[PDB]
Structures are given as C-alpha cells and as structure tokens.
Write a protein that holds these residues in place. Sequence first.
Motif, PDB file in Angstrom:
ATOM      1  N   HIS B 135      21.018 -23.708  22.897  1.00 37.42           N
ATOM      2  CA  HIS B 135      21.731 -23.681  21.622  1.00 37.42           C
ATOM      3  C   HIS B 135      21.090 -24.734  20.725  1.00 37.42           C
ATOM      4  N   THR B 136      20.305 -24.289  19.747  1.00 43.25           N
ATOM      5  CA  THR B 136      19.539 -25.206  18.919  1.00 43.25           C
ATOM      6  C   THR B 136      19.367 -24.613  17.529  1.00 43.25           C
ATOM      7  N   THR B 137      19.383 -25.478  16.520  1.00 47.84           N
ATOM      8  CA  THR B 137      19.115 -25.091  15.144  1.00 47.84           C
ATOM      9  C   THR B 137      17.723 -25.570  14.756  1.00 47.84           C
ATOM     10  N   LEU B 138      16.913 -24.664  14.218  1.00 46.65           N
ATOM     11  CA  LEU B 138      15.538 -24.960  13.842  1.00 46.65           C
ATOM     12  C   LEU B 138      15.414 -24.966  12.326  1.00 46.65           C
ATOM     13  N   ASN B 139      14.726 -25.973  11.796  1.00 49.67           N
ATOM     14  CA  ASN B 139      14.528 -26.083  10.357  1.00 49.67           C
ATOM     15  C   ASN B 139      13.379 -25.194   9.901  1.00 49.67           C
ATOM     16  N   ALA B 140      13.571 -24.538   8.755  1.00 46.35           N
ATOM     17  CA  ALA B 140      12.531 -23.697   8.162  1.00 46.35           C
ATOM     18  C   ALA B 140      12.780 -23.662   6.658  1.00 46.35           C
ATOM     19  N   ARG B 141      12.027 -24.472   5.912  1.00 43.05           N
ATOM     20  CA  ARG B 141      12.202 -24.610   4.471  1.00 43.05           C
ATOM     21  C   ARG B 141      11.055 -23.976   3.689  1.00 43.05           C
ATOM     22  N   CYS B 142      10.470 -22.909   4.223  1.00 39.41           N
ATOM     23  CA  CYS B 142       9.320 -22.274   3.603  1.00 39.41           C
ATOM     24  C   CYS B 142       9.747 -21.355   2.462  1.00 39.41           C
ATOM     25  N   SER B 143       8.781 -21.032   1.606  1.00 37.00           N
ATOM     26  CA  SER B 143       8.963 -20.090   0.512  1.00 37.00           C
ATOM     27  C   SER B 143       8.276 -18.774   0.850  1.00 37.00           C
ATOM     28  N   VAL B 144       8.793 -17.687   0.286  1.00 39.70           N
ATOM     29  CA  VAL B 144       8.357 -16.340   0.630  1.00 39.70           C
ATOM     30  C   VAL B 144       7.811 -15.658  -0.614  1.00 39.70           C
ATOM     31  N   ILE B 145       6.618 -15.086  -0.488  1.00 40.50           N
ATOM     32  CA  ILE B 145       6.014 -14.233  -1.503  1.00 40.50           C
ATOM     33  C   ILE B 145       5.727 -12.886  -0.852  1.00 40.50           C
ATOM     34  N   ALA B 146       6.103 -11.804  -1.528  1.00 43.06           N
ATOM     35  CA  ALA B 146       5.993 -10.493  -0.909  1.00 43.06           C
ATOM     36  C   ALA B 146       5.769  -9.427  -1.969  1.00 43.06           C
ATOM     37  N   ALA B 147       5.228  -8.295  -1.524  1.00 44.04           N
ATOM     38  CA  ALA B 147       4.975  -7.146  -2.380  1.00 44.04           C
ATOM     39  C   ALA B 147       5.442  -5.887  -1.671  1.00 44.04           C
ATOM     40  N   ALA B 148       6.033  -4.966  -2.429  1.00 46.16           N
ATOM     41  CA  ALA B 148       6.593  -3.749  -1.862  1.00 46.16           C
ATOM     42  C   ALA B 148       6.341  -2.577  -2.797  1.00 46.16           C
ATOM     43  N   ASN B 149       6.286  -1.376  -2.214  1.00 52.66           N
ATOM     44  CA  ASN B 149       6.066  -0.127  -2.923  1.00 52.66           C
ATOM     45  C   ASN B 149       7.394   0.485  -3.356  1.00 52.66           C
ATOM     46  N   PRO B 150       7.403   1.260  -4.437  1.00 49.56           N
ATOM     47  CA  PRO B 150       8.618   1.991  -4.810  1.00 49.56           C
ATOM     48  C   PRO B 150       8.893   3.118  -3.826  1.00 49.56           C
ATOM     49  N   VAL B 151      10.107   3.664  -3.922  1.00 50.76           N
ATOM     50  CA  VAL B 151      10.541   4.681  -2.965  1.00 50.76           C
ATOM     51  C   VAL B 151       9.662   5.923  -3.060  1.00 50.76           C
ATOM     52  N   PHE B 152       9.292   6.317  -4.274  1.00 50.46           N
ATOM     53  CA  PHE B 152       8.426   7.468  -4.477  1.00 50.46           C
ATOM     54  C   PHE B 152       6.968   7.030  -4.355  1.00 50.46           C
ATOM     55  N   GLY B 153       6.044   7.932  -4.682  1.00 49.79           N
ATOM     56  CA  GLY B 153       4.647   7.542  -4.743  1.00 49.79           C
ATOM     57  C   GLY B 153       4.370   6.570  -5.871  1.00 49.79           C
ATOM     58  N   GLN B 154       5.033   6.758  -7.009  1.00 46.08           N
ATOM     59  CA  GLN B 154       4.833   5.917  -8.178  1.00 46.08           C
ATOM     60  C   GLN B 154       6.183   5.557  -8.780  1.00 46.08           C
ATOM     61  N   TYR B 155       6.195   4.452  -9.519  1.00 47.03           N
ATOM     62  CA  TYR B 155       7.409   4.007 -10.185  1.00 47.03           C
ATOM     63  C   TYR B 155       7.844   5.017 -11.239  1.00 47.03           C
ATOM     64  N   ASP B 156       9.144   5.299 -11.277  1.00 52.43           N
ATOM     65  CA  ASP B 156       9.737   6.156 -12.299  1.00 52.43           C
ATOM     66  C   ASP B 156      10.445   5.264 -13.309  1.00 52.43           C
ATOM     67  N   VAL B 157       9.934   5.243 -14.542  1.00 56.18           N
ATOM     68  CA  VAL B 157      10.460   4.336 -15.559  1.00 56.18           C
ATOM     69  C   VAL B 157      11.750   4.829 -16.193  1.00 56.18           C
ATOM     70  N   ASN B 158      12.129   6.081 -15.960  1.00 51.96           N
ATOM     71  CA  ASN B 158      13.324   6.658 -16.561  1.00 51.96           C
ATOM     72  C   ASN B 158      14.555   6.544 -15.673  1.00 51.96           C
ATOM     73  N   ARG B 159      14.431   5.938 -14.500  1.00 51.98           N
ATOM     74  CA  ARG B 159      15.491   5.932 -13.505  1.00 51.98           C
ATOM     75  C   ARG B 159      16.123   4.551 -13.404  1.00 51.98           C
ATOM     76  N   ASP B 160      17.188   4.484 -12.621  1.00 56.79           N
ATOM     77  CA  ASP B 160      17.842   3.213 -12.345  1.00 56.79           C
ATOM     78  C   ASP B 160      16.894   2.321 -11.549  1.00 56.79           C
ATOM     79  N   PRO B 161      16.710   1.059 -11.943  1.00 61.46           N
ATOM     80  CA  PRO B 161      15.869   0.164 -11.130  1.00 61.46           C
ATOM     81  C   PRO B 161      16.317   0.065  -9.684  1.00 61.46           C
ATOM     82  N   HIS B 162      17.624   0.125  -9.425  1.00 59.28           N
ATOM     83  CA  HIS B 162      18.102   0.147  -8.047  1.00 59.28           C
ATOM     84  C   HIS B 162      17.710   1.440  -7.346  1.00 59.28           C
ATOM     85  N   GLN B 163      17.572   2.528  -8.103  1.00 53.09           N
ATOM     86  CA  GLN B 163      17.159   3.797  -7.517  1.00 53.09           C
ATOM     87  C   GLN B 163      15.715   3.755  -7.036  1.00 53.09           C
TER      88      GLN B 163
END
Lengths: 86, 201
Positions: B135-163
């Motif tokens: 039972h131990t707590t470990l410190n981790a104060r790092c920062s995260v940079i990431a990149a991800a693809n949209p749900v479709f092949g390409q971004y749809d500018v007419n849709r909800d950003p959450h969509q």
Amino acid sequence: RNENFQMSITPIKNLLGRDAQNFLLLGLLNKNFKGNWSLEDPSGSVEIDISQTIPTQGHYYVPGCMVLVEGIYYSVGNKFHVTSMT
Amino acid sequence: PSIYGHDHIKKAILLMLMGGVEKNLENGSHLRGDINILMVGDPSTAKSQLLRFVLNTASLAIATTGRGSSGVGLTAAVTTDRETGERRLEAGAMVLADRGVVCIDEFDKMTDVDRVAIHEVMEQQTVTIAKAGIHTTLNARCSVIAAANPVFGQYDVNRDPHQNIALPDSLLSRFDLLFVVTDDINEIRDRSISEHVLRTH
DNA sequence: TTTTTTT
DNA sequence: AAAAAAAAAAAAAAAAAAA
Ligand SMILES: Nc1ncnc2c1ncn2[C@@H]1O[C@H](COP(=O)(O)OP(=O)(O)OP(=O)(O)O)[C@@H](O)[C@H]1O
Ligand SMILES: [Mg+2]
C-alpha cells in the motif's frame, strides 16, 4: 540567345500559385475549344485579356505565331491581363 | 523551423515547457501548476512531427502510444527481485517522467480502461498501488501532450464539437487548451507549403 | 436475424 | 538440497446484446 535576354521568361504551368505579379512568357497563339484567345506551351495553357493591349506596330499578329507577352496574372478568374506584345 | 504555420501552436509549446509554479497551502492542500494541451485534427497535418520535436527538445520526456500500452503496466508493476526473492514495485512509464513531460500518440485509439487511470493522474497527480500486500502512494507531477484523430476520417465543421470527439468530457475538461487543425484547400497556401517542403528535401 | 463484444 | 509462484499478456468460445 538574344543579348537583351540573359529578364527571364517563366513557363506557363508555373503561373498557378501567384497573382498580382508581372511576368513574361511566349508560346503558340490560337483559339481554344470554347472560342477564346489562349497561349499554349509544353507546360500548359492560359487565357488572354486583350481589352487594354498596346502591340508593337510593324508585325502581322496572326494565330500560329510565336509572341512575347508581358502582363499581370489574376487568379480571381484565369485572365492574364496583357499590356504589351511583340 | 521545418514546420510551416502553426505559430500559435509553437507559442503554446513554449509556454508549456516552462509552466507556472506549484501552490501548496496548509489548509488548501495543493494546486496543479503546469499546462496540458490536446490536439485533434484532420490527418496529415504535422502533429506527430511536432510531438517528436517536443520529445527531442525537452529535457526529460517519455514517448507512449495508445495502442501499444496497458494501463496497469503504465503506472506500476509487481515483480520479484532475483537476488532477494522478494516482490517489489517496478516503476511505471509516466512515473519515470515525474516533473517532465509525457507525449501520447493515437490517444483516442487507446483502450477505455486505461483512460480512467489517466483521469486519476490528472486529478491530483498521484497514483496509489494497493495490491499483494503493498500500500503505497507514488508521486507523478508530469505534464501530458497528446494528439488524437476525429471520429470520422476527417473533421466535420458543421457538427457538434462533442460529436467529433470520442473522448468523454470528464477528462476533456481537464485539459487547459484544445486545438483544432484543418488543412483548408487554398492554392496560395498550397504553393507556399510546396515551396517550403521542396526546400527541405 | 445478424454481428458485435465481453467473459 | 531446491527456488515453484502471484502477477501479468495474449489467445480463444460462449453468451448476450444492439441494430
Ligand atoms: N506545415 C508543414 N510543414 C512541413 N511539413 C508538413 C507540414 N504539414 C504537413 N507536413 C508534412 O506532412 C506529413 C504528415 O506526417 P505526420 O504523420 O507527422 O502528420 P500528422 O498530421 O501528425 O498525421 P497523423 O494524424 O496521421 O499522425 C509529414 O511528412 C510532414 O512533413
Ligand atoms: Mg502524423
């Protein structure tokens, strides 16, 4: 090989990405399938704007003749507005 | 210098590499101190290249891929040291990068289970291991940079950003800055970027 | 009814 | 004479679920 030319001409196909800049080019002069005035080069072809052309007198400007064209490209349409021709 | 445009992205990276100070209060516990940035955009717009540049430029950084990682194997492991015959915790990936930065590629292509672990380390920057009598707590104060693809092949500018995004808002609200990149087709920009790329090669 | 995903 | 095993990773078949 001319003495004066050592400005340099630019092939037609290299005129797609620029506008509002003067150039210089030469090639066949003819009528396109539509019926407009065009210049043809091994690279490609463009259209000609003639409404304000001042040609060099003493020549029979005839379709099928090599001509030197100085003008301004415009990407809004595809018209190479000519201002001089010799 | 070999990446054209994206000036605001470069400014964001510069500000992230040297983020703000930590705040700790005798009554107010702790406040998070650095910046996190997420990238979502249409394919082939130079996100992985910029992430690789951030890898090389920063002092301490570790590279992770969404499909090539397991959440339990990302934070800690229970392995037995050979000489002593005793099982001791083995440091995980992002624990090694404490106070550094961790870059994740294909972030949205990760298994959902692992995602919850990320939320934990984005909540209080601390991972706890309670298993097999440790039972131990470990410190981790790092920062995260990431990149991800949209749900479709390409971004749809007419849709909800959450969509357009496959990630739940619970962890998306954690990220300070979100950027959307799209390659608008303009012949002038096409010629400029063509000149730049041909200059590079 | 079919394919998908979880156990 | 004996360290031998909890913790992981990867490969299926069955069932249930959603379209
Ligand atoms: N502005 C730019 N300057 C230089 N190169 C660019 C630019 N935009 C795109 N590229 C080129 O596009 C290619 C895309 O590569 P890369 O996979 O890194 O892109 P990406 O947008 O991160 O794609 P993905 O989401 O598929 O990972 C690279 O070879 C990169 O050089
Ligand atoms: Mg890429």
